[PDB]
Amino acid sequence: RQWALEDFEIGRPLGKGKFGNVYLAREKQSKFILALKVLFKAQLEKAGVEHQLRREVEIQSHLRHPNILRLYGYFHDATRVYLILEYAPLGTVYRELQKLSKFDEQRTATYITELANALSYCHSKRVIHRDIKPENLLLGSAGELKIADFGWSTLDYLPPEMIEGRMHDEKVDLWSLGVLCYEFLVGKPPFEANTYQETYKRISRVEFTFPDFVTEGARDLISRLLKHNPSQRPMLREVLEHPWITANSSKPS
Amino acid sequence: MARVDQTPRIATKETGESLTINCVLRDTACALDSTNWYRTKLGSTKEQTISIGGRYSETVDEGSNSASLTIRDLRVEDSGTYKCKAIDSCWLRREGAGTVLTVKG
Ligand SMILES: Nc1ncnc2c1ncn2[C@@H]1O[C@H](COP(=O)(O)OP(=O)(O)O)[C@@H](O)[C@H]1O
């Protein structure tokens, strides 16, 4: 704890989380604007996740990429842990989906490009992500996407190999991109059902269909990502080079 | 005076042998219980995570406040610099100084 609370001006709350609140903050020497996430130790130890979180924060502390939320540092006192985070002013992708219902092809392809860029960086360091949900994606000043949950190594977002209790590796991240590409264009994830049991079966048998408005290019990409056999999914390099992606994205690899 | 002592600091092995790396957290009651292991291949500085399984195993000793990594069936491609890094049970950052491994073969 070489950082301390006295190093920061505190402003208004940015939101409330499960184990505490997140505040707008400012580092005093540089005047740099940031977010300060305050975690209550008791809540951590109640959900039984404090040890897991310490492993995840350690991995996060090494990840430096435009589309991954930056962790600048951390410190603590008697009752609280403080994470020093990049400030993302435009909220979550989840809230944007609430406001718009679904995204056009430009916004979708741009978000998928940014995610593929981040995951390629992670794979280069042998880091993989768990499931990726819209609520776990924040938006920066230029509207660029940031992976924000520290989820490094909820049924609707899990791959067949994981719910079938089989072996898994970096290919799970390609499945995640397929589910999100579909959800961005359509407004809901592809295996959604009324019950847990139905959803499970739909995922395991890769049972999904497209609305007629989904274009041929998008259908081709989604169908390639959502293969039951992990080894049949494309490389991230192949996603970034896909003609539907290059025709619609407003950002590069 | 709290510190992690990582040994051995330098190691030379032949293809087929084994290496054990020990990381001991000294002079504190904070627990070294969350260790992640990392490697940087020879010629590079870029750090990659090590997955436990296969040729790689790990043990933890509460009495010595230590974590150990064992690599069996060493290959030439295993050569590089290994480090233990953790956030301990007191939420404090701990890192070993590194093990430079050369495998001939
Ligand atoms: N770095 C940040 N920048 C801007 N807003 C944030 C940041 N982190 C969290 N928020 C806002 O505050 C809320 C806090 O949620 P979060 O920290 O994800 O809680 P939990 O830990 O329960 O997931 C988020 O929904 C988001 O709107």
Author numbering:
A (entry chain A): 126 to 278, 292 to 391
B (entry chain B): 1 to 105
Give the original sentences from the paper that presented this experimental model.
Aurora-A is a Ser/Thr protein kinase that functions primarily in cell division and is overexpressed in breast, colon and other cancers. The activity of Aurora-A is stimulated by autophosphorylation of Thr288 in a flexible region termed the activation loop. Here, we describe the identification of a vNAR single domain antibody based on a shark heavy chain antibody scaffold that binds and inhibits Aurora-A. The crystal structure of the complex indicates an allosteric mode of action that is antagonistic to the mechanism by which TPX2 activates the kinase. In the crystal structure of the complex, Aurora-A adopts a canonical kinase fold, with a molecule of ADP sandwiched between the N- and C-lobe. vNAR-D01 has an Ig fold with two disulfide bridges. vNAR-D01 makes contacts with both lobes of Aurora-A, but does not closely approach the ATP-binding pocket.
